[PDB]
Amino acid sequence: SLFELGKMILQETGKNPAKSYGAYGCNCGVLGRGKPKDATDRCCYVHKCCYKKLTGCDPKKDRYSYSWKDKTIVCGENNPCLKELCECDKAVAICLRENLGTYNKKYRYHLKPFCKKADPC
Amino acid sequence: SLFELGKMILQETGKNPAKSYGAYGCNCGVLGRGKPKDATDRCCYVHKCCYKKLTGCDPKKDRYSYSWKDKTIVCGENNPCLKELCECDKAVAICLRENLGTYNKKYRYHLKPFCKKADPC
Numbered sequence: 693s694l695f696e697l698g699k700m701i702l703q704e705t706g707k708n709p710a711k712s713y714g715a716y717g718c719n720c721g722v723l724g725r726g727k728p729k730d731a732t733d734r735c736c737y738v739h740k741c742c743y744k745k746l747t748g749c750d751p752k753k754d755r756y757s758y759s760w761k762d763k764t765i766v767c768g769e770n771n772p773c774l775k776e777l778c779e780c781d782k783a784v785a786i787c788l789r790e791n792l793g794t795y796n797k798k799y800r801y802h803l804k805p806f807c808k809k810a811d812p813c
Numbered sequence: 814s815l816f817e818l819g820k821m822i823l824q825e826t827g828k829n830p831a832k833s834y835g836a837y838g839c840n841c842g843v844l845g846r847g848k849p850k851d852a853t854d855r856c857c858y859v860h861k862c863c864y865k866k867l868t869g870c871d872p873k874k875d876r877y878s879y880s881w882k883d884k885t886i887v888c889g890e891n892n893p894c895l896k897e898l899c900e901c902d903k904a905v906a907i908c909l910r911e912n913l914g915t916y917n918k919k920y921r922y923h924l925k926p927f928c929k930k931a932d933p934c
């Protein structure tokens with residue numbers, strides 16, 4: 693669920709999720725996958741692809757449990773889809789953090805036209 | 814679609830739609846709707862309800878035609894759902910613009926903290 697996704701991003705990056713990622717490049721935010729602008733955008737690209745692997749669970753709103761253990765994201769079990777949904781979220785949060793160095797604000801506000809077809813996930 | 818929408822919003826309000834509305838209050842932005850925090854938020858509220866009454870087309874992805882004439886959003890003919898969609902969008906753009914004076918960043922990059930809940934659209 694968006695609420696834990698955002699929270700994980702906050703915990704990992706220390707950044708306001710909605711704002712830094714809400715509309716970022718072609719993949720971070722509303723809509724679907726697009727050709728990534730940079731490493732950050734990629735994270736979200738991979739994240740949406742991860743979201744496809746899911747069936748059963750609803751990523752946008754399905755709640756799941758996870759804890760912040762030693763500044764690490766750890767979700768407890770929730771069941772198949774929910775758990776791997778968390779892992780999707782955890783992955784993107786870490787990925788956004790790992791890529792803060794190339795984070796580029798010009799990609800922060802949003803425009804999609806430039807977002808060419810995305811390769812198969 | 815959201816392009817038509819963000820764009821109408823930019824034309825009417827002059828503000829970056831994602832930045833100013835992408836996450837605002839309980840209704841401006843991502844997924845669900847809640848207890849309108851101010852006129853602005855309420856605008857997105859009505860808008861979502863407007864989206865929900867819609868049938869036959871997809872408000873997020875469905876493209877439609879409209880033009881900016883005499884600084885007014887004129888919904889192109891398209892089809893009834895697309896047209897309705899366009900009117901939903903035009904209506905929210907205008908409303909956001911109409912409530913720019915009461916717009917408070919406080920609610921921007923809002924995490925959906927203590928947003929009451931959905932009140933039947």
Ligand SMILES: *CC(=O)c1ccc(Br)cc1
Nearest residue numbers: 713714720721736739740
């Ligand atoms: C899947 C992903 O990275 C993402 C980022 C921002 C928003 Br809003 C939704 C999804």
Ligand SMILES: *CC(=O)c1ccc(Br)cc1
Nearest residue numbers: 835841842843857860861
């Ligand atoms: C309905 C509405 O105003 C709105 C604004 C931004 C986003 Br993202 C979605 C919906």
